[PDB]
Amino acid sequence: MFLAQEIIRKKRDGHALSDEEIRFFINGIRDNTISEGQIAALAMTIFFHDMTMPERVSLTMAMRDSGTVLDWKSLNLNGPIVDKHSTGGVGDVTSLMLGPMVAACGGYVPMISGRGLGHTGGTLDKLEAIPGFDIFPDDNRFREIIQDVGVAIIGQTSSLAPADKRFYATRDITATVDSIPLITGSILAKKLAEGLDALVMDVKVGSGAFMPTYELSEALAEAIVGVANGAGVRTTALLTDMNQVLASSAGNAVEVREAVQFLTGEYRNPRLFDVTMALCVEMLISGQLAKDDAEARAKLQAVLDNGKAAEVFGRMVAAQKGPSDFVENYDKYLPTAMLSKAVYADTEGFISAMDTRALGMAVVSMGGGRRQASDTIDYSVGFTDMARLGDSIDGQRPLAVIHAKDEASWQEAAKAVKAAIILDDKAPASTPSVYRRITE
Amino acid sequence: MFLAQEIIRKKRDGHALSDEEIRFFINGIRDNTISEGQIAALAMTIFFHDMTMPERVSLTMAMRDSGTVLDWKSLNLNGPIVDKHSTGGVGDVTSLMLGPMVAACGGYVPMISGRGLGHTGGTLDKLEAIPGFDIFPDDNRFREIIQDVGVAIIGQTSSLAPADKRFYATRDITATVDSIPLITGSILAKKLAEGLDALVMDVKVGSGAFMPTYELSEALAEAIVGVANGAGVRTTALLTDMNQVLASSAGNAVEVREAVQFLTGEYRNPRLFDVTMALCVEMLISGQLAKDDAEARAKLQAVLDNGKAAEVFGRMVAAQKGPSDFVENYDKYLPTAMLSKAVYADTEGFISAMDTRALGMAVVSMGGGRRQASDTIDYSVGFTDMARLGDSIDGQRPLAVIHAKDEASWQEAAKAVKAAIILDDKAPASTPSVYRRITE
Ligand SMILES: O=c1ccn([C@@H]2O[C@H](CO)[C@@H](O)[C@H]2O)c(=O)[nH]1
Ligand SMILES: O=c1ccn([C@@H]2O[C@H](CO)[C@@H](O)[C@H]2O)c(=O)[nH]1
């Protein structure tokens, strides 16, 4: 039998679907009661008529409710449940510092992530560089690590918005990926199943972005903001720059290292700090832990200054089966490439642009990520000492230090790197790291 | 892989397909190498954006070439391969006389007709009320029949427009049914695959029509005329009337009986005559057998009145393994319902309107139709001596005589009929049998 067809017919003639009906349809996407054709139809239908904000909210909550949602009340905490979501990026290690910095300021951050099949390097794989680290605690242990440390970074769940999976899969063959209320839907669902009080969204801007245009990035951000708030989750969003690598390194172990050193104070990429700081501020103000930006940045600076943030990162690692002294002796534990040598340019001048995606694939082809879904990850390879847009380039200053497993992989990695970076006789201009703050 | 999705995406955002693209997509349907979701999405994307005439012809020509297309060129037949297709309704028995009448005048009529699903009762169903009648002759048998008697009415093979199968199947679940070029593609394909030199289309109008409103019934006819003629087959289309039972009987055996008495001359329903004649006239003119309408009606009335048409029907039944003397001894071969008993109105007045859809549904409920193809048809059930739009009603004017399986099903039929026929003091406006003719 099919009541779904009525629902499709309704929305097809530009009517607005009800909460009850919206919840019906996705639940049947979950259970395979609703045919694939029907789903495609609905998708193409929503692709045409768009969706009202109430429809966007209902769709999002319904998807969020297709699986388990984490309840954090009853279990007693004096603070806000807050997380960060992001459309990802090369060098974007921010969540590794940001979780502990906020946890330190009174927030409880249950960061759930998705390795998926992502071409892009995922943070979950970054943490597996750390010997012993377990990305799959059970519900109970997860509740505790949040309860004591204030942050844990864990593995995905089928228990989280399962409807989205058949939904997305169908969307992907029917040219309906590509609709804002639908994207807003697949993006927000999983993240909202964490039972958040608050949220901040990082929408990338630039060449290396999920959204190819500033206005397009800004549009998504607004949409996401409007829908998230509408679901009783205090939310804002930031556009941030992805015209180059965000950190000074790209990979796994190597990126984990940058974060310990960011938290300890040993080294803070000024752009990565700008981003990281901006995001945490949002988590604090939305979370009702800071009155304004000045207060948040003060609270934030301090936990970086007294080592209390680095401590939280350290404890977290231990809570999750890692070595308890990781912060103090990270090099002791972090896998080290066999060959680690600077790559230099075929010419002089200033870096005027970089292709972050090419760079990102250079790393992948170095064992740094997964070409095939069955491949293993070599956690030691990556780049460090990434030159930056602006940097003057001679023959004495390297584009990067390529860490490889052997000279064969190192050399290809160097051709890829030289090829992905563009030099110019005259310098390009500064841009902010953080652009617009979006409240609604 | 498929590139199917790039064709979906292309029509979404409103672009022409181009045939190479369309022919490729139709075959994937037939071969099953294209997902149900991709059929749905493309149907939906067409409902929104519609198709051009070159897209319309391509669509139909493609579905038409997905199976076998019949050729009679070999047979060296003297006259035109003609046929008629109707969107049907309660009482529409026209083909039973039309085929022998047109055959009687020089045309060859290969009516391959399709199954009764779509709800309601079919032409093939009616014919099988005849003991011995076989609707599935093999390719040669069909040919030598058409060659010798000039007309055969046979059921559909696996190989006639098989692409429409899954196509319409998924359309009917996704609410992508009401699309004229989709309908025009579906309907014409099967019929154009018969090898027709010419064709007339009977598009019903009213409460018993496929289309809801007159203007849509016109729109479809126009499309069909345009495409059929586009596709290489002379074609005209008559908007005919269906606000009441066209014949005087509804059912299977009873409708066959009426066919016989129509040809011989025992009786002819005036309105059944108008439609049957006008459709046959088109076939004669479209089919190069009459220069003008008057000659056409003259050649048809002739064979209706020299017992020729009746004899052609006699030979066609016999050819298909009906009893050879059916025209003369039909009462002996057709099955008698167990209960035949009249139904009257519960109020005096004039018949102001009747729900034809409901009436047809009443007959199916009696056991004269198939809800689910598994069902057995009781061939002797139905209505006869049907009252008409306009008639005056009093205690001795029955709405109809009902042929029911038993007392239980008769009351049920009686109640449906009462509930479907509405009376009034005021005699409403008297509409024609044929509203418009379309060659343009
Ligand atoms: O595109 C379509 C849709 C329906 N039909 C069939 O034709 C009948 C009406 O002519 C319908 O009930 C259905 O059975 C077609 O031939 N083509
Ligand atoms: O409107 C109608 C319907 C049927 N009949 C006749 O009723 C008889 C039924 O046995 C046949 O002579 C048939 O022609 C009529 O006279 N008028």
Swiss-Prot record, chains A, B:
The keyword Transferase applies. Its EC number is 2.4.2.4. It comes from Salmonella typhimurium (strain LT2 / SGSC1412 / ATCC 700720). NCBIfam families: PRK05820.1 (NF004490), T_phosphoryl (TIGR02643), Y_phosphoryl (TIGR02644). Keywords: Glycosyltransferase, Transferase. Belongs to the thymidine/pyrimidine-nucleoside phosphorylase family. This is Thymidine phosphorylase. The enzymes which catalyze the reversible phosphorolysis of pyrimidine nucleosides are involved in the degradation of these compounds and in their utilization as carbon and energy sources, or in the rescue of pyrimidine bases for nucleotide synthesis. It catalyses: thymidine + phosphate = 2-deoxy-alpha-D-ribose 1-phosphate + thymine. Pfam families: Glycos_trans_3N, Glycos_transf_3, PYNP_C. Pathway: Pyrimidine metabolism; dTMP biosynthesis via salvage pathway; dTMP from thymine: step 1/2. One of its GO terms (molecular function) is thymidine phosphorylase activity. Homodimer. One of its GO terms (biological process) is thymidine metabolic process. GO terms for cellular component: cytosol.
